[PDB]
Amino acid sequence: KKWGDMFTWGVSTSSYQIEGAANQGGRGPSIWDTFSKIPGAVANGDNGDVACDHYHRYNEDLDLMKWLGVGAYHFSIAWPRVIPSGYGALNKEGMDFYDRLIDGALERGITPWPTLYHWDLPQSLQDKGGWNNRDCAYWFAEYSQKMAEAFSDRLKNWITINEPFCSAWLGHLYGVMAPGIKDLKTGINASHHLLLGHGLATKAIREVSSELKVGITLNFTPAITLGESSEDKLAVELADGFDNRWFGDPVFKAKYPEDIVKAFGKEVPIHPGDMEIISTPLDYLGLNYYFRQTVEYDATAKPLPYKQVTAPNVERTGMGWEVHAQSFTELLERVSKEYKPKEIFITENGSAWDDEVVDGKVDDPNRVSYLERHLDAMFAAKNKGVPISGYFAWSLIDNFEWAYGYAKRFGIIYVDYQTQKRIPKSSAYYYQKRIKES
Amino acid sequence: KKWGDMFTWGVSTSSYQIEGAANQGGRGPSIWDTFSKIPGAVANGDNGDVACDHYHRYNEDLDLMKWLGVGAYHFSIAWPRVIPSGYGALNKEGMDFYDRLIDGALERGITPWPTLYHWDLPQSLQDKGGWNNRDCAYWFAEYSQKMAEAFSDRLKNWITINEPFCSAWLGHLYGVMAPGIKDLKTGINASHHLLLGHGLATKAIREVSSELKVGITLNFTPAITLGESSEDKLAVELADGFDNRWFGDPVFKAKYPEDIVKAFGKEVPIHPGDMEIISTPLDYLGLNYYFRQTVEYDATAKPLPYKQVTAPNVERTGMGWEVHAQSFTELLERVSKEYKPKEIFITENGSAWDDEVVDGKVDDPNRVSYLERHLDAMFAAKNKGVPISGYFAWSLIDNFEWAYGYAKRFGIIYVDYQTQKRIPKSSAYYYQKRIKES
Amino acid sequence: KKWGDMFTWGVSTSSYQIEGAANQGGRGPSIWDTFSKIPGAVANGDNGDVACDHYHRYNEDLDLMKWLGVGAYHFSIAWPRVIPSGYGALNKEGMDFYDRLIDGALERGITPWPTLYHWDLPQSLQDKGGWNNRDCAYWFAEYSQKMAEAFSDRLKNWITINEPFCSAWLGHLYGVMAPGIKDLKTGINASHHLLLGHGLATKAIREVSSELKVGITLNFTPAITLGESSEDKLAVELADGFDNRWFGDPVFKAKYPEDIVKAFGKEVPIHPGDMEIISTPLDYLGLNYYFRQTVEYDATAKPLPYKQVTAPNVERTGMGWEVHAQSFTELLERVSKEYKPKEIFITENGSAWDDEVVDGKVDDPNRVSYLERHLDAMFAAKNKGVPISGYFAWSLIDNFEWAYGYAKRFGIIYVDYQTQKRIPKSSAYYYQKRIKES
């Protein structure tokens, strides 16, 4: 720690999870509007039609960010709000919303960090195959260029896509996220076109202005096993390849992990130039971390011969996810050594617990404890030399947690969905203190 | 200095010294209401009936704290305001006041740090023997548990008692503070029941919720001598034992200092189990420091054979207290090595000088200089590895300085008692700068 | 970097460059009011009659400082506004303006840092010879004492004069700044009387109160050559002596550089006591840096045998000034070794570029880049042990850039002179981020 070093504190959200106004302001439907209408797809039949009504309440939320003292707000632009047909005319009303949001953040001293793709693909493009269609990578790059042309006079730090693991595998192989497809080959195609879209968008953004910075957000789930057999060690290697190296290796090493390619037995649809584009240099890696996975070998499992294990006697959040902050330190060290990103921003970390409103307040000590321990673990890595330049808490506010719906609350600020009232939780006051006093 | 380390800047007050409204809002009398009615007990016949009228003016005072930029407000709860009879019924109007104060601080981003006992024992309990009565330790612990039950949803860092040296020795041996008693055995009893109350309250607070942190505040007065004789060196040891080790050794070593016990020749009323309670582990030590004492041997002095000396040719405050910041560094190092508290917060440090209002302003360069030098001395200890986690300036505002009355002004903000106007002094602007720029 | 170390972030302006109200509020004319009426003296015939109208709009400018988050505001007092006759009666209306400015800054948590002389000598004193007249040093010291008597209850950190290189050589030898004289002996006389005025004023300020701190602001222009001949190396020494050592050596070494004295062939008008006064100890050096100069030997040049060279293929600002941040680091190290000031404040650093307003906003990436690189270079020196205690950006707002007029914009905030609207530039948002996150 020397004179001149900086560190950025932020909060993170995404468009479909908070905005609402799903059928207002000219917005066209996304794959999540469609998916959340399918009986059984989302807990309690929840959807994002209203969410946190942030489309109308953004000034209140920006005021809460200023009150917390964050220097940065990591948010996503809803592609179907700004280009409802996916590829074609801009929706001026949608662009004006993001102008008002950005200008309001800047007036309050907050730097907006936009993510271009946080899972809300326009249904108009899914009707053409979505991410299974190679053209979707190019449609995304054109949308990205239009956003940079409109907003990069003010916004200098961009993220292309968020968590391709979820969009590709959960959305096209396991079918538990939109668009709900269940096919390995489609998942492989989608993974390649998400990554190609990232690379094409990066190049397009840089053509707008050479001062702009660009990265990608990857979630990493470190894998362990409780067994000692050679096959259980193989299970760890397979899970790590499927979750992590499948996406990190193309970006930083210009190739897919050969052990996983071989185990799939399928071809990735790589065309000339693709791997050069996907591996284009980035200004930073956005890293998301929540938990580690415990696995064991299972010869009957598909597409790869391993299964998840629920380890006994470990601390778990309201999601059932293991709490293990030491894995965060070790992951940060591993990524820095293995992939050597120029710098790292924690674009998401946080936890969900059963919250109760008592006397108009929300006391959430389990969320405070998770936050304290994960900030400590992150700084332990920074003190070892890992170039972590900022931390963005997921999330500012409780919101639509995808297939879990509204029942799973990640906010440091509580949202009463009956009234839309925001109530800062104990974790908000803790985070506010950490921002000021570090 | 490494990534993740934090430091807390605060200001400190106490309830009887600032609140006023002594016979309003359901408050019952304290031993200081009674003591201040006795001619000769307090300079100028001053009392705390009105003080700074903070009970009515707290919003203005919170606004001044936000303007200073402090992250923390160290305050005390008036036991006789919330439980006028000492044990038994809660006074709703008093509890509501502290709720409003706490909620107002949090709205402004300020963490309230409550002290449960800052010398205003309910007169109803003094009528039953006060701290001479072992039951007072249990009455205090029950009061503490009720406060944690009411406020610990928001308040996570607690202090039990403040400066038992003053309550025990000055209040029961020298009779210069309330309740004005002058008896060595009573002072010994009171010291044990204050410390036992601390331990019982700590255990009771932790039973409310396991996330809560608890400490005690001790003032330390380092002792030196100008002489070279062996008896003058003994005088230093005795004065150090009387002022400092008598209270620190029970808390951190589970025993009273044997040399002082022997010199007193009296029994401490220790019941089996008491020392384990008194020495229960703490999250932090609150340390108060203002000055060092100079002593010499005096065979005629009681209860111990030493006397205070007024060393010649040294800088002194308006209290007549020596200014010697290097002693602060050495004290912090000594406490850290001898008692090994997990962390230390400076809960009080400051100085009093004759202030003059000129053109509606107060320029107080001697207070600025004391503050600068003592902050430098504190950071010198931190740079040697002492875990000092925060500094709270005594005081936000001029107030009732106990037996000195209002004539002695410790505020960084001046109070005109005729109008209750608050005027920030030069020291307020200096402290505001230090909070921002360190 | 250790615990307790502080760093001050500021912005800088000067009175004639921003205030306007040149013939209002009792102000008398300065030498710049006169000079800017001379055809050909100032680009576009610009003058400071209106400037940024800060005399009326200071509340808005102070609000912008608070919004940026600076802790300090470096400004100058207009001698002809407060004493229109130069020596004699105070203009109460002018003094009241500075009271309002100072009190407004303090209400916002901003420490004002006054410069007493930033080039706007009263014309009433120029009519008596200005800085050519030795009495001007004493007139300046009397003015300085009156300002300290009025304002030092609040203002503790003073600067006497700013950039005597400009007032002496550009104003009296080259005639490109007011008062427009072109005579070497007059320039020598002026340089000595400026420096004597600095010393006399320092002594007078300290007589007002011993807590007050005083420094001087010097601009340094490091010199290099592209040639290898011994005569080109001599050119570097001459340029360094003329620009830098002529003013630094009297202040820190109590003598004028003998090589330059010999080359001028003229006597400096040194009287008994002068060099002791000029070299009086200072609490800090205010350092101004913008660029390095490239020179070569030229036997025909006067007063010294060197000329400026425009080095090929280097980055340059809108002023034509080379951008070379590494020279800033090396200058700071050299000053610390050569002159050993107790501490250094960067009282000015910044850059000018042609700005364009697009959609009501100003995106100035070249100014951002200069700022980023010069802050990095400054902190590189601090990390080597140079005692740089703060940085003041020139300037908060676009203003009257002397003989260049309004066409040259140094602000991080744009001023539309038709409307007086202030528009924060991208560089303002960058500086705001750096202040918060370092």
Author numbering:
A (entry chain A), B (entry chain C), C (entry chain B): 2 to 439
Sentences from the paper on this structure:
Here we report, in contrast, on a naturally occurring mutation of an otherwise invariant residue in the β-glucosidase BglM-G1 that balances a trade-off between structural stability and enzyme activity. β-glucosidases are enzymes hydrolyzing β-glycosidic bonds in substrates ranging from glycosides, to glucosylated flavonoids, glucosylceramides, and oligosaccharides, releasing nonreducing terminal glucosyl residues (see Ketudat et al. for a comprehensive review). They are also one of the key enzymes in the bioconversion of cellulosic material. The otherwise invariant arginine at position 75 changed to a histidine in this protein, while the other 36 amino acids deemed necessary for the function and structural integrity of members of this protein family remained unchanged. Our data indicate that the natural mutation to histidine at position 75 leads to the loss of an extensive electrostatic network, including a salt bridge in the active site region and implies that evolution of BglM-G1 traded a decrease in thermal stability for improved catalytic efficiency.
The fact that BglM-G1 evolved to be a fully active β-glucosidase with a naturally occurring substitution of the otherwise invariant arginine at position 75 provided us with the unique opportunity to study the structural implications of this amino acid in β-glucosidases. Based on size-exclusion chromatography, which showed that both proteins exist in a monomeric form in solution, we assume that the trimeric assembly in the crystal is packing-generated. Comparison of the structures of BglM-G1 and TmGH1 monomers revealed a root mean square deviation (RMSD) value of 0.53 Å over 313 Cα atoms and the conformation of the active site glutamates were highly similar. Upon solving the structure, we observed both in wild type and H75R an unresolved electron density within the active site tunnel. This density does not seem to originate from a peptide chain and we were not able to fit an atomic structure to it. There was, however, a major difference in electrostatic interactions between the mutation site and the active site nucleophile. The naturally occurring histidine at position 75 in BglM-G1 formed only a single hydrogen bond with the backbone oxygen of threonine 116, while arginine at position 75 formed, in addition to hydrogen bond interactions with residues Gln163 and Thr116, a salt bridge with the catalytic nucleophile glutamate at position 349 Fig. 2 CD spectroscopic analysis and X-ray crystal structure of BglM-G1 and its H75R variant. We then determined the melting temperature of both proteins by monitoring changes in ellipticity at 222 nm, while continuously increasing the temperature from 10 to 80 °C. For BglM-G1 the mid-point of transition was at 51.4 °C (324.6 K with a 95% confidence interval between 324.4 and 324.8 K), while the melting temperature of H75R was at 54.9 °C (328.1 K with a 95% confidence interval between 328.9 and 329.2 K).
